[PDB]
Design a protein around this ligand. Structure first.
Ligand SMILES: *Cc1cc2c(cc1C)nc1c(=O)[nH]c(=O)nc-1n2C[C@H](O)[C@H](O)[C@H](O)COP(=O)(O)OP(=O)(O)OC[C@H]1O[C@@H](n2cnc3c(N)ncnc32)[C@H](O)[C@@H]1O
Ligand SMILES: *Cc1cc2c(cc1C)nc1c(=O)[nH]c(=O)nc-1n2C[C@H](O)[C@H](O)[C@H](O)COP(=O)(O)OP(=O)(O)OC[C@H]1O[C@@H](n2cnc3c(N)ncnc32)[C@H](O)[C@@H]1O
Ligand SMILES: CCCCCCCCCCCC[N+](C)(C)CCCS(=O)(=O)O
Ligand SMILES: CCCCCCCCCCCC[N+](C)(C)CCCS(=O)(=O)O
Ligand SMILES: c1ccc2oc(-c3ncc[nH]3)cc2c1
Ligand SMILES: c1ccc2oc(-c3ncc[nH]3)cc2c1
Lengths: 499, 494
C-alpha cells in the first residue's frame, strides 16, 4: 500500500532501480505483471537442458554495469565457444573464416564492404549518444529507412546482402521498417560495428553460468515481499499529493514517485490521470518492438567442433529459417546445443508451423550449412517466440520507424510530473541490452534521489569502472581500412586519370 | 452486468453497431471511456459559434451509409461554400483558380503534375480495396515510403511539393512516415485522387446542419441508459462461458460477444485473458494515428467572397502554419469563419505556442493569402489539438509505416474468439472517415448476427443504395490527361 517509490516492471531495469533505492534507505515496491521477474530475460530449468536462456543471454566487454551488478549478486560468466572457425553461408554454400567479418576476395567488392562498415561508423560519430536528434543531418537521416541507405551506399549486391543480415540480426527488424538515423545511433551507442557484431571482444563474448534470469531473481531475493508478482499496473493518478498506482487484481499503491521500467509502448496498457502530455501520448503508439523466435537444438555432442567449426553460422538466403547461430553448449562441454534466431518477417512467417516442424527445418538447415548428417539427430529442442508476449511486445528491443526519433525522441526519458522512466530503451550505452537496462534503472532511481534532495544533480549520471574480469580491447583499424576509396571514390579517381 | 453484446467505444462506429444490434432485438451495452460520445467527432456549442465541428465534419457523394444513417436520425446537410475561386499560394503569391487541381503553365511541370496524379490512380487500380496486401506488387510498394515514391515519380520540385501537401492533408502524416502501398490503397478506397480531394462532387462537399456530433448523440438518445459514459474498458476475459468485460471504474459486464470499436492501437489499453494471438499482439503496437490541430477563425463577415474567393486555400511551404483551409461559414451566411488544419510535424511544432499565439499566426497567414487586412480582425477562435487525446491517439485516422500493411494488415478485421472489430480503420470504402465508421460498425454487428445464426453469411457485407440528396456524378478525364507522356516519357521520344 504506502511507500516511497513504486517501480512498475520487474525486469533487470526495474530490479536495478529498486535495489539502488532500497540500498539508499527508501521503501520501494516493485509491481510486476507476470508470475516471475526477469521480463525479456527468462532462464528455463528442466532436466534435459539443466538451464537455458530463452531471452537475453549475452554480455561482453564494455558492458560494465551488468557485469558489476551480476558480480555483486554472486554470478559468474563463461566465454561462448569461438575456438574453431566461423561459417558464412551464402548462395547455398559454406565458407569458413576467422575474424569479425567474412573475408572478401574480389578487390571491387572488398572496397565496397570496407567502405560500408567504415561509413556506418563514420556516420555514427556524428550522432550524440544522449541526443541523436542533435546530429547535424538528423532530419535527412531520420527521413530514410535503412533500406534506402543501403541502396545508396552499397555498390555491390554482396555488401547489400550482408548489411541486410546485419540490420536484421542487430534489431530484429527489416531494413525497410527502421529509420537510418535510429539504426546508426543504435550501433554507435554499442561501440560501433565491430563491437556489436563480435563474439570475442564484443557483445556476444560471454553468458552467465546458470542463466541471466538469476540477476532479477537474486534481486527479488534481496527485496523479499517488496516484489509483488501478478500485479499488472492499469492506472496511475497524479492529481493528488501522493501518486496512486492501481493494479488489475484490484490493489492500490500510494507513493511519492513512480519509475516506469517497462518497454515504452507498453505504457499504453496504463490509463493516466491526468492524461499524458501530447508528445508522450503519441510517442508510445509509434515505437514497436522487433520480432524473434529464439530456438535451441540439443545434440549428444558438439559435433561441429570435430569439423573445426565453432558453431557460429551467418546464413544468408530467404529459404533459411535461421540467419545466425552460436554454440550454446555448457562450459563443462555437455548439453551440446546450437542457438539460432529466426528474425523479423521469418518470425511472423514461421510462427504458423508446429514446434516439431520448426525443429525439422532448423536441423535440415544446420545439416546443410555444417555439411553434417549428425545435425539431423537432435536429442531435445527448446524455443520461445517473443512476439506472443503481452507484457514484452517483442524482442530484443524497441525500434524507431522513419521520422519518429527526431520528432518524439526528446521525450523518451523526460519525467512526467512524478513519473520517471527506466527500461533499456532509455539508456545511452547499450540501449536494447541487459547493460542498458542497468544504466537506465539506476539513472532513473538517482533522478528520484535528486528530486528528494538526497544527492546533487551531478550524481544523476554516473560513470562505471571497467570490469577487471572482462576487460575491453580497443577497436582498431589499419591504414588501408581507413584510406582505401569507396567504389564511387575509385570511379572518381578513374574519371580523373582519364581527364 | 448481463447483456447480449458489449460494444467498446461510443464513436460513430460503435454507435452504428449498437443501433443495428438493438434494432434487431438484442440487448446491447456501449462502454465509452469519455464523458461524451462521438470520439473523433466533437461538436462544440456556444453563443459565439452556434455550433462548430472540432473533429470530423465533411461528408460527400459516394458516402451513402453515413448519409442514410444521419438522415434516419433527422439530420440535414448543407454545401461547403465553393461558389467563388479557390487559391493556390506558392512561393509567396496567391494564384486563384477553379476546378479541383491548381493550373500548371510550364509545359514540363504540366506533364510532371499530370503524370503524378494519373500514376497514383493507375497504381490504385491494382490494389484490392478489401485486401491491399493482395496487390501484385504489394511487397515492393509496402517496403517504400511515400517520400521514396514521390522522389522516383516527380521530375519537378513543383509536383513533389504539391504531392507532399496532398499526402500531409489526406493522412495527417509526413510522406516519409507512411507506406506507399498503404497510402495508394487509402486514396483508391476513397474513389481516387479527384474524389478524395474535391469539395464539389468529392469528400468535402457537405457538412451536417448542427454538427456531426449529432450522429453519435442521437444514437445515444435512442439507446438511453444502455450507453455508459466514463467506463474505459481495462480487461477482457474470454476464458469462461460468457465474455467478461471490466471497466476502470470497477464495473463488470457479461456478454455473449464483444465489438471493439476503438482505433486499433488503443486495444493496447486493454489487458487480455487469454493473451491476444501473436499477430494482433504485435499489430496494435505498429499502427499510429496522425497529427492535426483543427482551427476555426471567426469574422464579422465572409469578406473573402467580395474578392471572388470562396475561402479554400492550398498553401505551400514550411513557414505557413496551415496548409489547407475551407470556408466554415454557416449556410445562412452568418458566423463567418475559415477552417484550417495544422498538419503532421507542424502540429507537433506549433503545439508549444499558446492559443492566442496560434491565432495571430493564422490571421497573419490568411491576411497574406487572401490579400485582405480584414483577416487581422478575428471576432472569435476555436481549436482542437487531437494529438493530446488519450482515447483517440490522434486524427484523422491510423496510418501504416513501411512494411506493416503486408505483414499485419490481414489481422485488422480478424475476430479473436468472440471479439469482432469495427472502427473506421477496418472499413473497405472511406476507411478513415465517418462513412467507414458506419460501414465497419454495421459489418461487425452483422458478423455477430451471423455467428448467432440469425442471418446467412452473404448478408454480412451489404451494399448501400445511393443517397437521393447527395448523388454522385462521374469522375472524368480528358484525352490529353490520359495520353500526355510523363517527363521520362517525353525524354524517350528524344
Ligand atoms: C527477448 C530477447 C531479448 C534479448 C536477446 C534475445 C531475446 C530473444 N538477446 C540479448 C542478449 O543476448 N544480451 C543482452 O544484453 N540483451 C538481449 N536481449 C534484450 C534484453 O533481454 C533486454 O534489453 C532487457 O532484458 C530489458 O530489460 P528491461 O528491464 O528494460 O525490460 P523488460 O525485461 O521488458 O522488463 C519489463 C517488465 O515489466 C513488466 N510489465 C510490463 N507491463 C507491465 C505493467 N503494466 N505492469 C507491471 N509490470 C509490467 C514485464 O512483465 C517485465 O517483467
Ligand atoms: C479528429 C478529426 C477527424 C476527422 C477529420 C478531422 C479531424 C480533426 N475530418 C473528417 C471529415 O471531415 N470527414 C470524415 O468523414 N471524417 C474525418 N475525420 C475522421 C472521423 O472523425 C473518424 O473517421 C471517425 O469519427 C472514426 O469513428 P470511429 O467510431 O471508428 O472511432 P472513434 O470516433 O475514435 O470512436 C472510438 C470511441 O472509443 C472510445 N474509447 C477508446 N478507448 C476506449 C476504451 N478502452 N474503453 C472504452 N471506450 C474507449 C473513444 O473515447 C471513442 O469515443
Ligand atoms: C554514360 C556514363 C554513365 C555512367 C553513370 C553511372 C550511373 C550510376 C548509377 C549507379 C547507382 C549505384 N547505387 C549504389 C545503386 C546508388 C549510388 C547512389 S549515389 O549515386 O552515389 O548518390
Ligand atoms: C547527356 C547527359 C544527359 C543528362 C540526363 C540527366 C538525368 C538525371 C536526372 C534523373 C533523376 C530524376 N529523378 C526523378 C530524381 C529520379 C527518376 C527515377 S528513375 O530514374 O526513373 O528511376
Ligand atoms: C553480418 C551479420 C552477422 C554477423 O555476425 C558477424 C560475426 N559473428 C562473430 C564475429 N562476427 C558478422 C556479421 C555480419
Ligand atoms: C494538393 C493538396 C491539397 C489540395 O486540395 C485540392 C482541392 N481542394 C478543392 C478541390 N481541389 C487539390 C489539392 C492538391
Amino acid at each position: 500500500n504506502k511507500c516511497d517509490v513504486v517501480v512498475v516492471g520487474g525486469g533487470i531495469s526495474g530490479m536495478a532501480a529498486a535495489k539502488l533505492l532500497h540500498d539508499s534507505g527508501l521503501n520501494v515496491v516493485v509491481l510486476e505483471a507476470r508470475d516471475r521477474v526477469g521480463g525479456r530475460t527468462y532462464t528455463l530449468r528442466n532436466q534435459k537442458v539443466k538451464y537455458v536462456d530463452l531471452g537475453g543471454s549475452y554480455v561482453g566487454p564494455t558492458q560494465n554495469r551488468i557485469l558489476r551488478l551480476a558480480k555483486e549478486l554472486g554470478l559468474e560468466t563463461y566465454k561462448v565457444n569461438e575456438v574453431e572457425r566461423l561459417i558464412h553461408h551464402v548462395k547455398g554454400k559454406s565458407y569458413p573464416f576467422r575474424g569479425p567479418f567474412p573475408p572478401v576476395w574480389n578487390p571491387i567488392t572488398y572496397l565496397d564492404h570496407n567502405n560500408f562498415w567504415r561509413t556506418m561508423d563514420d556516420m555514427g560519430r556524428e550522432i550524440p549518444s544522449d541526443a541523436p536528434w542533435k546530429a547535424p543531418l538528423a532530419e535527412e537521416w531520420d527521413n530514410m529507412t535503412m533500406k534506402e541507405l543501403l541502396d545508396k551506399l552499397c555498390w555491390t549486391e554482396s555488401a547489400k546482402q550482408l548489411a541486410t543480415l546485419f540490420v536484421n540480426l542487430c534489431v530484429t527488424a527489416e531494413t525497410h521498417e527502421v529509420s537510418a538515423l535510429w539504426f546508426l545511433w543504435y550501433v554507435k551507442q554499442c561501440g560501433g560495428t565491430t563491437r556489436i557484431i563480435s563474439t570475442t571482444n564484443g557483445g556476444q563474448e560471454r553468458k552467465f553460468v546458470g542463466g541471466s534470469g538469476q540477476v532479477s531473481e537474486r534481486i527479488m531475493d534481496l527485496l523479499g515481499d517488496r516484489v509483488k508478482l501478478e500485479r499488472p499496473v492499469i492506472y496511475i493518478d497524479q492529481t493528488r499529493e501522493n501518486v496512486l498506482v492501481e493494479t488489475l487484481n484490484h490493489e492500490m499503491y500510494e507513493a511519492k514517485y513512480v519509475i516506469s521500467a517497462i518497454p515504452p509502448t507498453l505504457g499504453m496498457k496504463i490509463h493516466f490521470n491526468p492524461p499524458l502530455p501530447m508528445m508522450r501520448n503519441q510517442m508510445i503508439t509509434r515505437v514497436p518492438l522487433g520480432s524473434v523466435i529464439k530456438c535451441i537444438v540439443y545434440y549428444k555432442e558438439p559435433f561441429w567442433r570435430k569439423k573445426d567449426y565453432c558453431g557460429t553460422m551467418i546464413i544468408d538466403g530467404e529459404e533459411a529459417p535461421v540467419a545466425y547461430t552460436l554454440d550454446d553448449t555448457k562450459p563443462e562441454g555437455n548439453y551440446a546445443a546450437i542457438m539460432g534466431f529466426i528474425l523479423a518477417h521469418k518470425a511472423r512467417k514461421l510462427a504458423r508451423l508446429t514446434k516439431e516442424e520448426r525443429l525439422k527445418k532448423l536441423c535440415e538447415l544446420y545439416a546443410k550449412v555444417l555439411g553434417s548428417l549428425e545435425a539431423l539427430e537432435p536429442v531435445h529442442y527448446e524455443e520461445k517466440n517473443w512476439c506472443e508476449e503481452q507484457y514484452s511486445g517483442g524482442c530484443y528491443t524497441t525500434y524507431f520507424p522513419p521520422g519518429i526519433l527526431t520528432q518524439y525522441g526528446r521525450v523518451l526519458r523526460q519525467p512526467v510530473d512524478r513519473i520517471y522512466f527506466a527500461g533499456t530503451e532509455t539508456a545511452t550505452h547499450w540501449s536494447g541490452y541487459m547493460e542498458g537496462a542497468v544504466e537506465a534503472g539506476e539513472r532513473a532511481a538517482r533522478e528520484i534521489l535528486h528530486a528528494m534532495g538526497k544527492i546533487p544533480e551531478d550524481e544523476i549520471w554516473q560513470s562505471e569502472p571497467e570490469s577487471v574480469d572482462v576487460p575491453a580491447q580497443p577497436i582498431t583499424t589499419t591504414f588501408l581500412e581507413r584510406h582505401l576509396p569507396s567504389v564511387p571514390g575509385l570511379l572518381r579517381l578513374i574519371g580523373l586519370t582519364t581527364i
